[PDB]
Design a protein around this nucleic acid. Structure first.
Ligand SMILES: [Mg+2]
Ligand SMILES: [Mg+2]
Ligand SMILES: [Mg+2]
Ligand SMILES: [Zn+2]
Lengths: 135, 106, 93, 248, 29, 94, 69
RNA sequence: AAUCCGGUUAAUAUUCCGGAACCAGAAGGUGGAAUCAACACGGCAACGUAAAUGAAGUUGGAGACGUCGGCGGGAGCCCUGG
C-alpha cells in the first residue's frame, strides 16, 4: 500500500535529472536533519544506452550498450512513481546516508551501480527501465 | 545650468536615439548614447521569462559561455521548470494509457 | 454614496448621444466588463480581451476562450451546443 | 461630368488595409487523412484579427508526410479554447470545433465556415455570430441542402466540409457605435470607405444626384439592372422600396 | 542478441510519418 | 443517500485531508482509502491522481460538481479540488 | 583596467611575456599602486604598506621594466 | 556587432594626440578543462560553475512594438548645513 519502497521504479520530475528513470534504494518516509522531508535514495540512468541492431559490429555494440548512472537523494515530491519495479540484486545496503558525505564513496557506489545496471541491460529483463522517456 | 546636445546626427527622440546624462572628469555634463534594454528568453509553453539567464540584446547572447544561456535540465533555456515537469508527467501517463488500451484491445 | 441614479458606467458620456443610445450602451458595457466564471478552474477570473476573446488569470488555466462579443457565452451558442449534443447522441445509439 | 466615387473604387487608395492581419482564415487543404479518416490538431492561440469581428484560432497539426508541424488559421467557433483538440475529417466526431463533410452530419446541425465546393477551404457563414444549418441530404448523387445566414437555401456537394458550431464574436452589431470616432476606428483597419458624402450633396459633374436649387434626386432612385457604370447609383434593380411591414 | 527488438511502425492515418513511397503517378512533370 | 451526506458524515467524525499536496502525501503513505476528485479538476492532474490511487490500491470517485461544490460539500468556504479520506469514522463511504 | 587583489597573482602576471612595463604610483595617503601593462589590460595592485611595497618591488622579476611616476 | 575620458587647431575631431577599452572575422600561438574506454560535478528543489563532445532534421526564444492614469526607485539638475 506504500507506493515508494525499495525496488520500485520512479520518474524524476525536477532537477538536473528531470525525466530520468530511477530505482528506489531506501525510502526514508520521515525527515532527517539533513533533508527534513520524506526523501528517497535512488539510482538512475544519466545516459541511456543507444539502440543496437544486427548490422552493427561487435565493438560498436559494446560502445553503444553502456549506462552512465547517478545516485541521488530526492524529495518524494520530485518523484513520479511508476508500476514497474526492478530486482535490485546487490544494490541493497551499499548506498546509505553515509556514502554521500564522501566523494570517494560516491564514485565507488556509482561504479558499483554502473556494473549492475549495465549487466542488467544486457539480457534485458527490465527493458522499459533503460529506454528514455520521450517528452 | 549646463545643457546638452546629441552626439550623433540623428536629431529625433527615436528608440535608437536613447541617451542618459554623464558627468565627466572635466566637470562636463553631456549625453551618453545607450542601447535598448535586453530581454530574458521566454518559455515556449507558458511564455514566462526563464530563470537563470540575463536580459540581453539578441547578438549579445553570442558572447556568453554556454551555461549562462541555459539551465542544467531537460529543455533548459527553452522551457520553464514547471512546464518541463508537466511534460514529463503528461508523457508518462499518456504512454501508460496507451499500454492499457493496447492490453485491453486483445 | 450612489453618485448616479441611472446612467451608471455611461455617466462618462455626460448628456451626449441620446438617452436611449446611452441606455443600450449601458446594458452592453456592464456585460463586456463583467467577471465571469471559468468552467475549467472554477475561479471568477474570466475577463474580456477584444470582442470574442476571454482570458484567465493565475498560474493555472492560462487558457483563452472564444466567446461572444460582450458575454462569454451567447444564447445562440448555448442552444446550438445542446442541439448538436442531442444530434450526436442520437446517431451514436 | 467626371468619374463618380463608385467608379474610382477599383484599387489604389481603396485597397484593404492588411498590414495588421496575420493570415487568411482557411479550413485546411483537403487531403488523404480528411478524405478517409480524421486528423487531430491542438488550438495554440485564439487571436484578434484587425478588421474582422470574429476571433481567429491558430491550430497546430502534424504533417503526415514530413517531420514538421503545420499551423492552420481557423475562424474560431464559440466555445473553442487554447489547448483544445480539434479533429478534421470524414470520421471526426460531431463536437463543436470539429471539421466534417456536411454529408456526414445529421439534418439540423449548426455549422460555420462551410465550403461551396469540396476543398475550397471555407466560404459560408464566417462573420461573427453567423452559421449555416443543414436542411437535408440527397444520398443519390450526394448533395446537401443548407440554409445560409441571408435566409437563402443552397445546395452544396455532400463532401464540402463545415465546422461544427457558430462563429465566435457573438452579437457585435447590437452595440451602438455612438460616435463618429468609433466608426472611424472600425473602418481605419478595414478600407477607405468612411465617412460617406451623399450624392445629393454634390454638384451635377460629380454624381447623377448632384445639383439643383434644393437637395433632391430629380428622377427615380431605383435604376435598372443594366445601367452603365457612372449611372448605376441609388437603389439598383430594386424589386420594391419603402418600409416593409411583414416580410419573408 | 536480446537487445535487437522489433520496433514496428503502424502507418495508419495520423499515426506514423508515411514511408517514402513511389509518387511517380502524382508527379507534376 | 447522497455522497454529500456521506461526506458530511465523514467530516463530523472521521479523518480527511483537503487539497492536492496533502492528498498525494496520504496516497504515498498508503493511508488514503478513498479520494474524491472535483469534476472540473485539471485533466492531467486527474490522470496523475488516478495513477497514484491505482498504485496504492485506493478508490477514486470522480463525482459531479466543481471544486466550488466540493468545497461547499465539505462545509468549507473555499474551493476544494480533491479530497482524501484516511478514515470513514462512522460513515458508509467505503 | 583590472584590479589584482593578491601579490602572488600580480607576480605571476609580471613573469608572463606580455607584461611590458610596470608603474609605481605613490598616493598622498601613503598607499602605493603597482600597475602592470599587458596587451589587453592594465592590472593594478593596491599595496597599503610601505614595507610591503618595498618587498614587492624587490620581489619583481629582475628584467621587468619598473617605471616611477 | 563594437569607444570613453583628458588634451589639441586660425579653422577637424566620439575621427587627430595621450591614456584607457570594445566588437567582428581568420588561422591556431601557449595555458587550462573533460575523456584508461566517452564526452564534468554540486544542489530536495528553484538552480549553480572558469571550461563541461554534439552532424542532419525539427521546435522554441530574442529582434518585436498602442495609448492614457497614478504609484515606487535611480541618474543629472535644483535647493540646503559646515
Ligand atoms: Mg454645394
Ligand atoms: Mg451627370
Ligand atoms: Mg567647428
Ligand atoms: Zn480559469
Amino acid at each position: 500500500v506504500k507506493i515508494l519502497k525499495p525496488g520500485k521504479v520512479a520518474l524524476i520530475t525536477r532537477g538536473r535529472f528531470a525525466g530520468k528513470k530511477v530505482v528506489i534504494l531506501q525510502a526514508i518516509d520521515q525527515g532527517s536533519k539533513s533533508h527534513p522531508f520524506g526523501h528517497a535514495v535512488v539510482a538512475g540512468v544519466e545516459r541511456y544506452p543507444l539502440k543496437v541492431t544486427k548490422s552493427m559490429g561487435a565493438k560498436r555494440i559494446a560502445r553503444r550498450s553502456r549506462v552512465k548512472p547517478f545516485i541521488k537523494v530526492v524529495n518524494y515530491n520530485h518523484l513520479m512513481p511508476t508500476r514497474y519495479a526492478l530486482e535490485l540484486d546487490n544494490l541493497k545496503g551499499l548506498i546509505t546516508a553515509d556514502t554521500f558525505k564522501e566523494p570517494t564513496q560516491r564514485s565507488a557506489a556509482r561504479k558499483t551501480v554502473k556494473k549492475t545496471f549495465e549487466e542488467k541491460y544486457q539480457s534485458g529483463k527490465s527493458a522499459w527501465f533503460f529506454t528514455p522517456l520521450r517528452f | 545650468a549646463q545643457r546638452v546636445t546629441y552626439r550623433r546626427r540623428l536629431a529625433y527622440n527615436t528608440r535608437s536615439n536613447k541617451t542618459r546624462i554623464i558627468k565627466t572628469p572635466g566637470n562636463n555634463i553631456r549625453y551618453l548614447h545607450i542601447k535598448k534594454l535586453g530581454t530574458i528568453p521566454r518559455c515556449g509553453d507558458t511564455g514566462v521569462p526563464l530563470q537563470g539567464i540575463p536580459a540581453l540584446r539578441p547578438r549579445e547572447f553570442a558572447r556568453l559561455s554556454h551555461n549562462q544561456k541555459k539551465v542544467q535540465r531537460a529543455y533548459g533555456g527553452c522551457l520553464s521548470a514547471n512546464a518541463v515537469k508537466d511534460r514529463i508527467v503528461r508523457a508518462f501517463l499518456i504512454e501508460e494509457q496507451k499500454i492499457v488500451k493496447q492490453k485491453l484491445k486483445q | 454614496t450612489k453618485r448616479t441614479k441611472k446612467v451608471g458606467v455611461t455617466g462618462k458620456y455626460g448628456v451626449r448621444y441620446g438617452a436611449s443610445l446611452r441606455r443600450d450602451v449601458r446594458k452592453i458595457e456592464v456585460q463586456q466588463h463583467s467577471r465571469y466564471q471559468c468552467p475549467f478552474c472554477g475561479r471568477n477570473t474570466v475577463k474580456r480581451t477584444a470582442a470574442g476573446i476571454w482570458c484567465c488569470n493565475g498560474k493555472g488555466c492560462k487558457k483563452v476562450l472564444a466567446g461572444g462579443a460582450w458575454t462569454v457565452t451567447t444564447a445562440a451558442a448555448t442552444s446550438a451546443r445542446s442541439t448538436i449534443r442531442r444530434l450526436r447522441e442520437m446517431v451514436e445509439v | 461630368g467626371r468619374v463618380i466615387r463608385a467608379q474610382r473604387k477599383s484599387g489604389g487608395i481603396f485597397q484593404a488595409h492588411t498590414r495588421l492581419r496575420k493570415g487568411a482564415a482557411q479550413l485546411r487543404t483537403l487531403d488523404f487523412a480528411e478524405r478517409h479518416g480524421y486528423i487531430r490538431g491542438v488550438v495554440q492561440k485564439i487571436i484578434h484579427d484587425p478588421g474582422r469581428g470574429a476571433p481567429l484560432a491558430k491550430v497546430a497539426f502534424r504533417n503526415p508526410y514530413h517531420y514538421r508541424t503545420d499551423v492552420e488559421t481557423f475562424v474560431a467557433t464559440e466555445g473553442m479554447y487554447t489547448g483544445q483538440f480539434v479533429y478534421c475529417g470524414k470520421n471526426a466526431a460531431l463536437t463543436v470545433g470539429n471539421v466534417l463533410p456536411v454529408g456526414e452530419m445529421p439534418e439540423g446541425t449548426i455549422i460555420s465556415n462551410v465550403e461551396e465546393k469540396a476543398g475550397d477551404r471555407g466560404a459560408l457563414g464566417r462573420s461573427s455570430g453567423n452559421y449555416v444549418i443543414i436542411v437535408g441530404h440527397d444520398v443519390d448523387t450526394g448533395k446537401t441542402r443548407v440554409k445560409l445566414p441571408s435566409g437563402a437555401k443552397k445546395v452544396v456537394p455532400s463532401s464540402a466540409r463545415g465546422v461544427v458550431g457558430i462563429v465566435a464574436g457573438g452579437g457585435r452589431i447590437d452595440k451602438p457605435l455612438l460616435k463618429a470616432g468609433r466608426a472611424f476606428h472600425k473602418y481605419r483597419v478595414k478600407r477607405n470607405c468612411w465617412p460617406r458624402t451623399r450624392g445629393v450633396a454634390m454638384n451635377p459633374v460629380d454624381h447623377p444626384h448632384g445639383g439643383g436649387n434644393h437637395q433632391h434626386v430629380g428622377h427615380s432612385t431605383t435604376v435598372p439592372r443594366q445601367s452603365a457604370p457612372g449611372q448605376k447609383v441609388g437603389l439598383i434593380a430594386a424589386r420594391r422600396t419603402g418600409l416593409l411591414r411583414g416580410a419573408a | 542478441n536480446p537487445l535487437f527488438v522489433s520496433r514496428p511502425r503502424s502507418f495508419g492515418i495520423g499515426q506514423d510519418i508515411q514511408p517514402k513511397r513511389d509518387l511517380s503517378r502524382f508527379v507534376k512533370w | 443517500d447522497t455522497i454529500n451526506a456521506k461526506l458530511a458524515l465523514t467530516m463530523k467524525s472521521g479523518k480527511y485531508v483537503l487539497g492536492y499536496k496533502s492528498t498525494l502525501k496520504t496516497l504515498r503513505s498508503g493511508k488514503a482509502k478513498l479520494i474524491l476528485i472535483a469534476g472540473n479538476c485539471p485533466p492531467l492532474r486527474k490522470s496523475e491522481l488516478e495513477y497514484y490511487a491505482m498504485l496504492s490500491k485506493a478508490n477514486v470517485h470522480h463525482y459531479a460538481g466543481t471544486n466550488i461544490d466540493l468545497g461547499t460539500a465539505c462545509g468549507k468556504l473555499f474551493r476544494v479540488g480533491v479530497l482524501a479520506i484516511t478514515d470513514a469514522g462512522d460513515s458508509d463511504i467505503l | 583596467p583590472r584590479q589584482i587583489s593578491d601579490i602572488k597573482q600580480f607576480l605571476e602576471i609580471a613573469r608572463r611575456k606580455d607584461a611590458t612595463s610596470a608603474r609605481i604610483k605613490k598616493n598622498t595617503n601613503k598607499d602605493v599602486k603597482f600597475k602592470l601593462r599587458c596587451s589587453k589590460y592594465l592590472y593594478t595592485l593596491v599595496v597599503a604598506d610601505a614595507k610591503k611595497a618595498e618587498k614587492l618591488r624587490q620581489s619583481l622579476p629582475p628584467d621587468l621594466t619598473v617605471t616611477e611616476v
